[PDB]
């Protein structure tokens, strides 16, 4: 769920050719001849999880610390981004 307007260059003209080609196959609008795509062209991006970052409060040796951890979704590898303390309780 992210939106934007994109320019109407060659990539967008190729999108219009595909749509007219596909509609000609369906036939519900006769035989159509592609002319051009005009402004505006709106584009939605659908996302998927690449990775994560966690911010923790962690007790260690009865003292409280802040830690940031990063995690890859595919390999599940983790990195310590930050570790400091003692910090006051939240």
- For its own copies, what does the binding mask look like between residues 30 and 49, x meaning CB under 8 A? xxxxxxxxxxxxxxxxxxxx
List, in order, residues 6 or more apart from 59 with CB less than 8 Å away: 65
Number of residues near its own copies (by CB under 8 A): 56
What is the contact surface with Mg ion in residues (CB under 5 A)? 4-5, 9-11, 33, 38-39, 48-49, 61, 79
Query: Which residue number, 10 or 30, has a Cβ lying nearer to its own copies?
Result: 30
Q: Is 34 exposed, middle or buried (0-12, 13-18, 19+ CB in 10 A)?
A: middle
Contact predicate 17/36, CB 8 Å: no
22 belongs to the binding site for its own copies (CB under 8 A): yes
């Amino acid at each position: 769920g992210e939106w934007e307007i994109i320019d109407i260059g060659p990539f967008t003209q190729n999108l219009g050719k595909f749509a007219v080609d596909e509609e000609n196959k369906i036939g519900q609008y006769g035989r159509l001849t592609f002319n051009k795509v005009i402004r505006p062209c709106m584009k939605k991006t659908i996302y998927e999880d690449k990775g994560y970052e966690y911010q923790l409060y962690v007790y260690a040796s009865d003292k409280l610390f802040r830690a940031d951890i990063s995690e890859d979704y595919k390999t599940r590898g983790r990195k310590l981004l930050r570790f400091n303390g003692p910090v006051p309780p939240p």
